[PDB]
């Protein structure tokens, strides 16, 4: 899930 | 937010070059997709962090953001190697440190077929003499058109960037009907990069099935999704 | 030729509908593929005749008009079929006696979630209130785009039709920004149709192996390619 | 094969 992770932080 | 403000952004949101850091030599089939998974790998973070600057795409629901990217992430990837070989006929350029021959993709059964799709859309790109300004925007529709109160955002930021790459067609100067010609005939090629961006999963996910090559996470997620 | 005549031309080279008629009994897995199957080998046989009707066709090489045959006709098959269901909703019409609801999909492990994408495309192509004559345009765009001197008389014949297409979308009288606009947003669907159509054909290459429904001839060949 | 001949032959 790291898609959904970087997709909520900078 | 006019047409070349919105263009403005893209370029803005532009990954940064990526090289995979290998020192020249020969290609094995072995060192060949071992490069271009871990090409893929990191190109996929930059491209989460270049749809986020995007307008509009981070205020889409969490869904929609998620299942734009997963289902068109190879597409997009494809299109980017495609304006970067655009300059060097014969040659596709994943990265710097990444050029590969036609006959070079023969050293891994059905690559091949591949390499001579990208080859040939490339070559077609290069006809038409394809502008830094209408990759951009064309990169764009690949993401936002992919969607096989959060939809009509969808739709109107779509729709945004396709009023941009008309505008960048028209700044060209050219007459109306070759403005129209030339705008039918790039989202024409889409079809194109599709088709060899499906063919690119298929031979991927065969080749991640046999564990033949180190399937990082991130690639590993994107193409366990697209599948599924 | 001018893209008027063009599209007369295509207008006229319309296949006609094939008949076909639904099983009496309620669909089985099996009846059901055996009814797709079945219509596309008829519709398969129209769809070449219709293919020598445009304009140059005949006039590539024998190789490129089999390469884009075996490339598209799928995605003919179902631009035929979202044309033929557009004003149903909630219904996809392969036939005039073979009008299937969404939910009878559910007998077809796996077919359900084309015929939703079928349908989304289709309420896509009812919301922008496609026009025969546009259609007519786009479903022969789909074939000669397929290239998936002759490559260069191929390119000629391609850019006839959008010439063709752009014309008719003139003759809605709407301004320039917006006739790009409208060309722009039916081209731009020709990715979902393909989508669709991609699912259908492994969808029945799985659907042949599994031994569900017999797959010969024509049909075979098409989907081998 | 029926492609061919419907191509041709017809
Ligand atoms: C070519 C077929 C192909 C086949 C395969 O098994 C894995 C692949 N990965 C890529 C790829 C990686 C990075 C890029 O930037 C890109 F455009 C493509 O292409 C691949
Ligand atoms: C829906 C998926 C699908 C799945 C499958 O295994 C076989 C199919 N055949 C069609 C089809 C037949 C005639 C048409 O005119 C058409 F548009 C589609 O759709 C099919």
Redesign the interface.
């Known amino acids: 899930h790291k898609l959904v992770q970087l997709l909520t932080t900078t | 937010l006019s047409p070349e403000q919105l263009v403005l952004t893209l370029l803005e949101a532009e990954p940064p070059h990526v090289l995979i850091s290998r020192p020249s030599a020969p290609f094995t089939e072995a060192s060949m997709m071992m490069s271009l998974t871990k090409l893929a790998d990191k190109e996929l973070?930059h491209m989460?962090?270049w749809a986020?600057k995007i307008p509009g795409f981070?205020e889409l629901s969490?869904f929609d953001?998620?299942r734009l990217?997963?289902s068109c992430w190879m597409e997009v990837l494809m299109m980017g190697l495609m304006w970067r070989s655009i300059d060097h006929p014969g040659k596709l350029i994943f990265a710097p440190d990444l050029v590969l021959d036609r006959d070079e993709g023969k050293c891994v059964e059905g690559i091949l077929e591949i390499f001579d799709?990208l080859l040939?859309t490339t070559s077609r790109f290069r006809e038409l003499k394809l502008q830094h300004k209408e990759y951009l925007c064309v990169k764009a529709?690949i993401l936002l058109?992919?969607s096989?109160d959060s939809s009509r955002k969808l739709a109107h930021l779509?729709?945004a960037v396709?009023?941009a790459?008309?505008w960048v067609?028209a700044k060209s100067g050219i007459s109306?009907?070759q403005?129209?010609?030339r705008?039918?005939?790039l989202?024409?090629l889409?079809?194109?990069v599709?088709?060899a961006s499906?063919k690119g999963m298929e031979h991927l996910l065969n080749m991640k099935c046999k564990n033949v090559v180190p399937v990082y996470?991130?690639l590993l997620?994107?193409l366990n999704?697209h599948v599924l």
Chains 1, 4 share one sequence.
Request: proline fraction near 0%; charge should be negative; glycine fraction near 0%.
């Open positions: 973070v989460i962090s986020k981070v969490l953001q998620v990217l997963e799709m040939a529709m058109n992919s096989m779509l729709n396709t009023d790459l008309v067609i109306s009907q403005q129209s010609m705008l039918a005939n989202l024409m889409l079809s194109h599709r088709h499906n996470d991130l997620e994107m999704a």
